[PDB]
């Protein structure tokens, strides 16, 4: 597999705050950002292993980039170019956030800092709440996307039968903003039954579990991005079968991937 990066993983390595890749950052001003509100790109400096997959991450309604910023370097340091975006306005709705997540990825293709660092054919989307809805919208609008991860996603659209991108739906058990029964679990249920997909509910978690560092969220996002952005079979072990993880309330997966 040409896309494998970094040494073989262990529980300790995917749980780490910082992975085996030293990371740098560059900022995209709102003036430099076409179709999104700007953001921060995190990327590995080690280019000896080749180019990396790219990941765009959106915050939710009324939220700034800081609400999801911790994911940027934590994921990038596992071997990805990660842009944490601001939206054009903080009031933008899920469908617009999905446009902006795609525009942020496109910006990566011509960004002078990272355009040599990215494999433009291997891209993924993530978001929190309405940003997680944007991630689903972005995958539904672009079947070439390698992975999508809605974190406590919120969306008026509940049917996602058009998605062809491997999607990890991360619910929070005690979510009252975006209750898992009317959002996350509904999304997972409408994804195609043939799709490589997984639903993971975080035990006792509030809607805001992913606005502050959470090891369970990070470890399975990293395992998902590895498995599907990099086609990295070494990371299937953390997904299939279900992990005996007390942090997880419910788990569904179309294993084996």
Q: Per-domain residue ranges for the chain?
A: 1-257
- Asked about 119 being catalytic, the answer comes back as no
Partners of 80 in beta bridges: 53
From the candidates 58, 67, 96, 129, which is the catalytic residue? 129
Secondary structure class of 82 (helix, strand, coil): strand
User: What percent of the chain is helix, strand and coil (3-state, nearest 5)?
Assistant: 30, 25, 50
Sign of CA dihedral 110, 114, 116, 120: negative
If one counts every other C-beta atom within 10 angstroms of the C-beta of residue 194, the result is: 8
Helical pair 130-140 and 94-110, crossing angle rounded to 10 deg? 70
- Asked about 129 being catalytic, the answer comes back as yes
Partners of 126 in beta bridges: 57, 149
Sign of CA dihedral 107, 112, 113, 114: positive
From the candidates 184, 207, 221, 232, which is the catalytic residue? 207
Q: How far is CA 188 from the centre of its chain?
A: 15
From the candidates 86, 92, 95, 175, which is the catalytic residue? 175
The tokens 């005690």 sit on which residue? 174
Instruction: Please state, in angstroms and rounded to a whole number, the distance separating the CA atoms of residues 100 and 53.
Output: 18
Instruction: Please state, in angstroms and rounded to a whole number, the distance separating the CA atoms of residues 255 and 91.
Output: 37
If one counts every other C-beta atom within 10 angstroms of the C-beta of residue 2, the result is: 9
Experimental determination approach used:
X-ray
Q: Dump the DSSP string for 242-256.
A: ----TTEEEEEE---
Sign of CA dihedral 102, 90, 38, 72: negative
Instruction: Please state, in angstroms and rounded to a whole number, the distance separating the CA atoms of residues 207 and 14.
Output: 23
């Amino acid at each position: 597999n040409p896309y494998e990066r970094g040494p073989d993983p262990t529980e300790s390595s995917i749980e780490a705050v910082r992975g085996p890749f030293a990371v740098a950052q560059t900022t995209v001003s709102r003036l430099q950002a076409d179709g999104f509100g700007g953001g921060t790109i995190y990327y590995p400096t080690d280019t000896s292993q080749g180019t990396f997959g790219a990941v765009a991450i959106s915050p939710g309604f009324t939220a700034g980039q800081e609400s999801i910023a911790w994911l940027g370097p934590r994921i990038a340091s596992q071997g990805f170019v990660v842009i944490t975006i601001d939206t054009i306005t903080r009031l933008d709705q899920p469908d617009s956030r999905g446009r902006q997540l795609q525009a942020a990825l496109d910006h990566l293709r011509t960004n002078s800092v990272v355009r040599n660092r990215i494999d433009p054919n291997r891209m993924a989307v993530m978001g929190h709440s309405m940003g997680g809805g944007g991630a689903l919208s972005a995958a539904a609008n672009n079947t070439s996307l390698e992975a999508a991860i809605p974190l406590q996603g919120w969306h008026t659209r509940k049917n996602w039968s058009s998605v062809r991108t491997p999607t990890l739906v991360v619910g929070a058990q005690l979510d009252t903003i975006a209750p898992v029964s009317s959002h996350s679990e509904a999304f997972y249920n409408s994804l195609p039954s043939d799709l490589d997909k997984a639903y993971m509910e975080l035990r006792g978690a509030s809607h805001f579990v992913s606005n502050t560092p959470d090891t369970t969220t990070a470890k399975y996002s990293i395992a998902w991005l590895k498995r599907f952005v990099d086609n990295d079979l070494r990371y299937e072990q953390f997904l299939c079968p279900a992990p005996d993880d007390f942090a997880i309330s419910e788990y569904r997966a179309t294993c084996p991937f």
